Structure formats: structure tokens, C-alpha cells
Coordinates of N, CA and C and ligand atoms in Angstrom, one line a residue:
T1 N 57.6 -104.6 -51.2 CA 58.9 -105.1 -51.7 C 59.7 -104.0 -52.2
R2 N 61.1 -104.1 -51.9 CA 62.0 -103.1 -52.3 C 62.8 -103.5 -53.6
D3 N 62.3 -104.5 -54.3 CA 63.0 -105.2 -55.4 C 62.5 -104.7 -56.7
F4 N 63.2 -103.8 -57.4 CA 62.9 -103.2 -58.7 C 63.5 -103.9 -59.8
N5 N 64.1 -105.1 -59.6 CA 64.8 -105.8 -60.7 C 63.9 -106.1 -61.8
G6 N 64.4 -106.0 -63.0 CA 63.7 -106.5 -64.2 C 63.7 -105.7 -65.4
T7 N 63.0 -106.1 -66.5 CA 62.7 -105.3 -67.6 C 61.3 -104.9 -67.5
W8 N 61.1 -103.5 -67.6 CA 59.8 -102.9 -67.3 C 59.3 -102.2 -68.6
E9 N 58.1 -102.5 -69.0 CA 57.5 -101.9 -70.2 C 56.5 -100.9 -69.9
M10 N 56.5 -99.7 -70.5 CA 55.6 -98.6 -70.2 C 54.2 -99.0 -70.5
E11 N 53.3 -98.8 -69.6 CA 51.9 -98.9 -69.9 C 51.1 -97.5 -69.8
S12 N 51.7 -96.5 -69.1 CA 51.1 -95.2 -69.1 C 52.1 -94.2 -68.8
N13 N 51.8 -93.0 -69.3 CA 52.8 -91.8 -69.1 C 51.9 -90.6 -69.0
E14 N 51.9 -89.9 -67.9 CA 51.1 -88.8 -67.6 C 52.0 -87.6 -67.4
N15 N 51.7 -86.5 -68.1 CA 52.4 -85.2 -68.0 C 53.9 -85.2 -68.2
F16 N 54.4 -86.1 -69.1 CA 55.8 -86.0 -69.4 C 56.1 -84.7 -70.0
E17 N 55.2 -84.1 -70.7 CA 55.4 -82.8 -71.4 C 55.7 -81.7 -70.4
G18 N 55.0 -81.6 -69.3 CA 55.2 -80.6 -68.3 C 56.6 -80.8 -67.6
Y19 N 56.9 -82.0 -67.3 CA 58.2 -82.3 -66.7 C 59.3 -81.8 -67.6
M20 N 59.3 -82.1 -68.9 CA 60.4 -81.7 -69.8 C 60.4 -80.2 -70.0
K21 N 59.2 -79.5 -70.0 CA 59.2 -78.1 -70.1 C 59.8 -77.4 -68.9
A22 N 59.5 -77.9 -67.7 CA 60.1 -77.4 -66.5 C 61.7 -77.6 -66.5
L23 N 62.2 -78.5 -67.4 CA 63.6 -78.7 -67.6 C 64.1 -77.8 -68.7
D24 N 63.3 -77.1 -69.4 CA 63.6 -76.2 -70.5 C 64.2 -77.1 -71.7
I25 N 63.7 -78.3 -71.9 CA 64.0 -79.0 -73.1 C 63.5 -78.3 -74.3
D26 N 64.3 -78.2 -75.4 CA 63.9 -77.5 -76.6 C 62.7 -78.1 -77.2
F27 N 62.0 -77.2 -78.0 CA 60.7 -77.6 -78.5 C 60.7 -78.8 -79.4
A28 N 61.7 -78.9 -80.3 CA 61.6 -80.1 -81.2 C 62.0 -81.4 -80.6
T29 N 62.9 -81.4 -79.6 CA 63.2 -82.6 -78.9 C 62.0 -83.0 -78.0
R30 N 61.4 -82.0 -77.3 CA 60.2 -82.2 -76.5 C 59.1 -82.8 -77.4
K31 N 58.8 -82.1 -78.5 CA 57.6 -82.6 -79.3 C 57.8 -84.0 -79.8
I32 N 59.0 -84.4 -80.1 CA 59.2 -85.8 -80.4 C 59.1 -86.7 -79.1
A33 N 59.7 -86.2 -78.0 CA 59.8 -87.1 -76.9 C 58.5 -87.4 -76.1
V34 N 57.6 -86.5 -76.2 CA 56.3 -86.7 -75.6 C 55.5 -87.8 -76.2
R35 N 55.8 -88.2 -77.5 CA 55.2 -89.2 -78.1 C 55.6 -90.6 -77.7
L36 N 56.8 -90.7 -77.0 CA 57.6 -91.9 -76.9 C 57.1 -92.9 -75.8
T37 N 57.2 -94.2 -76.1 CA 57.0 -95.2 -75.1 C 58.4 -95.6 -74.6
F38 N 58.6 -95.8 -73.3 CA 59.8 -96.1 -72.7 C 59.9 -97.6 -72.2
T39 N 61.0 -98.2 -72.2 CA 61.3 -99.4 -71.5 C 62.4 -99.2 -70.5
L40 N 62.3 -99.7 -69.3 CA 63.3 -99.6 -68.2 C 63.9 -101.0 -68.0
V41 N 65.2 -101.1 -68.0 CA 65.9 -102.2 -67.5 C 66.6 -101.9 -66.2
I42 N 66.3 -102.5 -65.1 CA 66.9 -102.2 -63.8 C 67.6 -103.4 -63.3
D43 N 68.9 -103.2 -62.9 CA 69.7 -104.2 -62.2 C 70.0 -103.7 -60.8
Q44 N 69.5 -104.4 -59.8 CA 69.6 -104.0 -58.4 C 70.2 -105.1 -57.6
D45 N 71.3 -104.8 -56.9 CA 72.0 -105.7 -56.0 C 72.3 -105.0 -54.7
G46 N 71.5 -105.2 -53.7 CA 71.7 -104.4 -52.5 C 71.5 -103.0 -52.7
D47 N 72.5 -102.2 -52.3 CA 72.5 -100.7 -52.6 C 72.8 -100.4 -54.0
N48 N 73.4 -101.3 -54.8 CA 73.9 -100.9 -56.1 C 72.8 -101.0 -57.2
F49 N 72.6 -99.9 -57.9 CA 71.6 -99.8 -58.9 C 72.3 -99.5 -60.3
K50 N 71.8 -100.2 -61.3 CA 72.1 -99.7 -62.7 C 70.8 -99.6 -63.4
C51 N 70.5 -98.5 -64.0 CA 69.3 -98.2 -64.7 C 69.5 -97.8 -66.1
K52 N 68.6 -98.3 -67.0 CA 68.7 -98.0 -68.4 C 67.3 -97.7 -68.9
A53 N 67.0 -96.5 -69.3 CA 65.7 -96.2 -69.9 C 65.9 -96.0 -71.4
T54 N 65.1 -96.6 -72.2 CA 65.3 -96.6 -73.6 C 64.0 -96.2 -74.3
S55 N 64.2 -95.5 -75.4 CA 63.1 -95.2 -76.4 C 63.7 -95.1 -77.7
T56 N 62.9 -94.7 -78.7 CA 63.4 -94.5 -80.1 C 64.2 -93.2 -80.2
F57 N 64.1 -92.3 -79.2 CA 64.8 -91.0 -79.4 C 65.6 -90.6 -78.1
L58 N 65.0 -90.8 -77.0 CA 65.6 -90.4 -75.7 C 66.0 -91.6 -74.9
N59 N 67.3 -91.7 -74.5 CA 67.9 -92.7 -73.7 C 68.4 -92.0 -72.4
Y60 N 68.3 -92.7 -71.3 CA 68.9 -92.2 -70.0 C 69.4 -93.4 -69.2
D61 N 70.7 -93.2 -68.9 CA 71.4 -94.2 -68.1 C 71.9 -93.6 -66.8
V62 N 71.7 -94.3 -65.7 CA 72.2 -93.9 -64.4 C 72.7 -95.1 -63.6
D63 N 73.8 -95.0 -62.9 CA 74.3 -96.0 -61.9 C 74.5 -95.3 -60.6
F64 N 74.1 -95.9 -59.5 CA 74.3 -95.2 -58.2 C 74.3 -96.3 -57.1
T65 N 74.7 -95.8 -55.9 CA 74.6 -96.6 -54.7 C 73.7 -95.9 -53.8
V66 N 72.7 -96.6 -53.3 CA 71.8 -96.0 -52.3 C 72.6 -95.5 -51.1
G67 N 72.3 -94.2 -50.8 CA 72.9 -93.6 -49.6 C 74.2 -92.9 -49.9
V68 N 74.7 -92.9 -51.1 CA 76.0 -92.3 -51.5 C 75.7 -91.2 -52.4
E69 N 76.0 -89.9 -52.0 CA 75.8 -88.8 -52.9 C 76.7 -88.9 -54.2
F70 N 76.2 -88.5 -55.3 CA 77.0 -88.6 -56.5 C 76.7 -87.4 -57.4
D71 N 77.6 -87.1 -58.3 CA 77.5 -86.0 -59.3 C 76.9 -86.6 -60.5
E72 N 75.9 -85.9 -61.1 CA 75.2 -86.3 -62.3 C 75.2 -85.2 -63.3
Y73 N 75.6 -85.5 -64.5 CA 75.6 -84.6 -65.6 C 74.5 -85.1 -66.6
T74 N 73.4 -84.4 -66.7 CA 72.2 -84.9 -67.4 C 72.3 -84.6 -68.9
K75 N 73.4 -85.1 -69.5 CA 73.8 -84.9 -70.9 C 72.6 -85.2 -71.8
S76 N 71.9 -86.3 -71.6 CA 70.9 -86.8 -72.5 C 69.6 -86.0 -72.4
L77 N 69.5 -85.1 -71.4 CA 68.2 -84.4 -71.1 C 68.5 -82.9 -71.3
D78 N 68.7 -82.2 -70.1 CA 68.8 -80.8 -70.1 C 70.2 -80.3 -70.0
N79 N 71.2 -81.2 -69.9 CA 72.6 -80.8 -69.9 C 73.0 -80.0 -68.7
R80 N 72.6 -80.4 -67.5 CA 72.9 -79.6 -66.3 C 73.7 -80.5 -65.3
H81 N 74.4 -79.9 -64.4 CA 75.0 -80.6 -63.3 C 74.2 -80.6 -62.1
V82 N 74.0 -81.7 -61.5 CA 73.3 -81.8 -60.2 C 74.0 -82.7 -59.2
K83 N 73.8 -82.5 -57.9 CA 74.3 -83.4 -56.9 C 73.1 -84.3 -56.5
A84 N 73.2 -85.6 -56.8 CA 72.1 -86.5 -56.7 C 72.3 -87.5 -55.4
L85 N 71.2 -87.9 -54.9 CA 71.2 -88.7 -53.7 C 69.9 -89.6 -53.7
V86 N 70.1 -90.9 -53.6 CA 69.0 -91.8 -53.7 C 68.9 -92.5 -52.3
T87 N 67.7 -92.5 -51.7 CA 67.5 -93.0 -50.4 C 66.2 -93.7 -50.3
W88 N 65.9 -94.5 -49.2 CA 64.7 -95.1 -49.0 C 63.8 -94.4 -48.1
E89 N 62.5 -94.2 -48.4 CA 61.5 -93.7 -47.5 C 60.5 -94.8 -47.4
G90 N 60.5 -95.6 -46.4 CA 59.8 -96.9 -46.4 C 60.2 -97.8 -47.6
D91 N 59.2 -98.1 -48.4 CA 59.6 -98.9 -49.6 C 59.6 -98.0 -50.8
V92 N 59.6 -96.7 -50.7 CA 59.7 -95.8 -51.8 C 61.1 -95.4 -52.0
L93 N 61.7 -95.5 -53.2 CA 63.0 -95.1 -53.6 C 62.9 -93.6 -54.0
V94 N 63.7 -92.7 -53.3 CA 63.6 -91.3 -53.5 C 64.9 -90.7 -54.0
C95 N 64.9 -90.0 -55.1 CA 66.1 -89.3 -55.6 C 65.8 -87.8 -55.5
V96 N 66.8 -87.1 -54.9 CA 66.8 -85.6 -54.9 C 68.0 -85.2 -55.7
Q97 N 67.8 -84.3 -56.7 CA 68.8 -83.8 -57.6 C 69.0 -82.3 -57.2
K98 N 70.0 -82.0 -56.4 CA 70.2 -80.6 -56.0 C 70.9 -79.8 -57.1
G99 N 70.3 -78.7 -57.4 CA 70.9 -77.8 -58.5 C 70.1 -76.6 -58.7
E100 N 70.1 -76.0 -59.9 CA 69.3 -74.8 -60.0 C 67.8 -75.0 -60.1
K101 N 67.4 -76.2 -60.3 CA 65.9 -76.5 -60.3 C 65.5 -76.9 -59.0
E102 N 64.4 -76.4 -58.5 CA 63.8 -76.7 -57.2 C 63.0 -78.0 -57.3
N103 N 62.9 -78.7 -56.2 CA 62.1 -80.0 -56.1 C 62.3 -80.9 -57.4
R104 N 63.6 -81.0 -57.8 CA 63.9 -81.9 -58.9 C 64.3 -83.2 -58.4
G105 N 63.8 -84.3 -59.0 CA 64.2 -85.6 -58.5 C 63.2 -86.6 -59.0
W106 N 63.1 -87.7 -58.4 CA 62.1 -88.7 -58.7 C 61.8 -89.7 -57.6
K107 N 60.7 -90.4 -57.6 CA 60.4 -91.4 -56.7 C 59.9 -92.6 -57.4
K108 N 60.3 -93.8 -56.9 CA 59.9 -95.0 -57.5 C 59.4 -96.0 -56.5
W109 N 58.3 -96.8 -56.9 CA 57.8 -97.8 -55.9 C 57.1 -98.8 -56.7
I110 N 56.8 -99.9 -56.1 CA 56.0 -101.0 -56.7 C 54.6 -101.0 -56.0
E111 N 53.6 -101.1 -56.8 CA 52.2 -101.1 -56.2 C 51.5 -102.2 -56.9
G112 N 51.1 -103.2 -56.1 CA 50.7 -104.5 -56.7 C 51.9 -105.1 -57.3
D113 N 51.9 -105.3 -58.6 CA 53.1 -105.9 -59.3 C 53.5 -105.0 -60.5
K114 N 53.3 -103.7 -60.5 CA 53.7 -102.7 -61.5 C 54.7 -101.8 -60.8
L115 N 55.5 -101.2 -61.7 CA 56.5 -100.2 -61.2 C 55.9 -98.8 -61.6
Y116 N 56.0 -97.9 -60.6 CA 55.6 -96.5 -60.7 C 56.8 -95.6 -60.6
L117 N 56.9 -94.7 -61.5 CA 58.0 -93.7 -61.5 C 57.4 -92.3 -61.5
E118 N 57.7 -91.5 -60.6 CA 57.2 -90.1 -60.5 C 58.3 -89.2 -60.7
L119 N 58.3 -88.4 -61.7 CA 59.4 -87.5 -62.1 C 59.0 -86.0 -61.7
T120 N 59.8 -85.3 -61.0 CA 59.4 -84.0 -60.5 C 60.5 -83.0 -60.9
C121 N 60.0 -81.8 -61.3 CA 60.8 -80.6 -61.5 C 59.9 -79.4 -61.3
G122 N 60.3 -78.5 -60.3 CA 59.5 -77.3 -60.0 C 58.2 -77.8 -59.5
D123 N 57.1 -77.2 -60.2 CA 55.8 -77.5 -59.8 C 55.2 -78.6 -60.7
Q124 N 56.0 -79.3 -61.5 CA 55.5 -80.3 -62.5 C 55.7 -81.7 -62.0
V125 N 54.8 -82.6 -62.2 CA 54.9 -84.0 -61.8 C 54.5 -84.8 -63.0
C126 N 55.4 -85.8 -63.3 CA 55.1 -86.7 -64.4 C 55.0 -88.1 -63.7
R127 N 53.9 -88.9 -64.1 CA 53.8 -90.2 -63.5 C 53.9 -91.2 -64.7
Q128 N 54.7 -92.2 -64.5 CA 54.8 -93.3 -65.5 C 54.6 -94.6 -64.8
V129 N 53.9 -95.5 -65.5 CA 53.6 -96.9 -64.9 C 54.1 -97.9 -65.9
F130 N 54.8 -98.9 -65.3 CA 55.4 -100.0 -66.1 C 55.0 -101.3 -65.6
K131 N 54.9 -102.3 -66.5 CA 54.6 -103.7 -66.1 C 55.9 -104.5 -66.3
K132 N 56.0 -105.5 -65.4 CA 57.2 -106.4 -65.5 C 57.0 -107.3 -66.7
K133 N 58.0 -107.3 -67.6 CA 57.8 -108.1 -68.8 C 57.7 -109.6 -68.5
Ligands
RH6_201 C1 65.2 -96.9 -60.9 C2 65.3 -95.4 -61.1 C3 66.2 -95.0 -62.2 C4 65.4 -94.4 -63.3 C5 64.9 -93.1 -63.0 C6 64.6 -92.3 -64.1 C7 64.5 -90.9 -63.9 C8 64.2 -90.1 -65.0 C9 63.9 -90.7 -66.3 N1 63.6 -89.8 -67.4 C10 63.1 -90.4 -68.7 C11 61.7 -90.9 -68.6 C12 63.7 -88.4 -67.3 C13 65.2 -87.9 -67.2 C14 64.0 -92.1 -66.4 C15 64.3 -92.9 -65.3 O1 64.4 -94.2 -65.5 C16 65.0 -95.0 -64.5 O2 65.2 -96.1 -64.8

């Protein structure tokens, strides 16, 4: 299924610390943020996505259309400009964020009935798993 709609509650978070370090997030924001549990609210209609990730300290909002390149200013994270593009590889949603970081982006898929989110920057990979509320 290609249908990521819903409210998704974190059940596991692996190596968020390495992902944020590869982004050069400052120590005190990082040290707080690696403790956090996240909730995802995804609204998906065809190509049109609206995503909202929330925690007690870090929030991240993105809206995009599959197949349409867009500019992203990662204000809530590392404060960089990237050229982002989200496309389908089979049933995996793939985002590439072109900028000064290599292999920066993410991949999302459903396995069974959970949502998997893989965050990449440089040589670091973070894996998060969510359950549909
Ligand atoms: C449905 C895909 C949108 C989406 C992708 C995300 C990428 C990165 C992040 N974080 C915080 C965990 C790092 C910047 C969150 C996120 O959530 C989403 O809903």
C-alpha cells in the first residue's frame, strides 16, 4: 500500500543521535532531542502530502507534491537550504535533499501495518517505527 494517511505514534527510534550529529545540531538541542518521542500526522491526497512531526521540543512541518522539486529551508533543524524531491520507488516514498550534505534525505514505507521512516545524512542512518493510532 502507498497510503500513509493517519496519526502515527512512535514505537521505536534507532540512531536519531547520529543523524542529528551528521547535521551538526548543537549539543544542547541534540541532548534534549534524542530523548524525545515523536508523533506524525500525515495527510495524503494523491500526490499532495502534508506532514507534521511533533514532540515536546522539536517540531517539523513539510508540504510537498510527489514528483515536483521544491526548496526547503530546514529552519527547525540545522537551518540549511536544500532542493528536495520526493518520488516513489515501488511502494517506498523516497526524498532526496540536495545540498552541502551528501546522501541526505529520507525513505518511508509501510510494513505490515506500521510506518517506517529512515532518515539519512552522510554515513548515518536513523530508523523510526510508528503505529497507526
Ligand atoms: C511522510 C514523510 C514526511 C516526514 C518526514 C520526516 C523527515 C524528517 C523528520 N525529522 C524529525 C524526526 C528530522 C528532520 C521527520 C519527518 O516526519 C515526517 O512526517
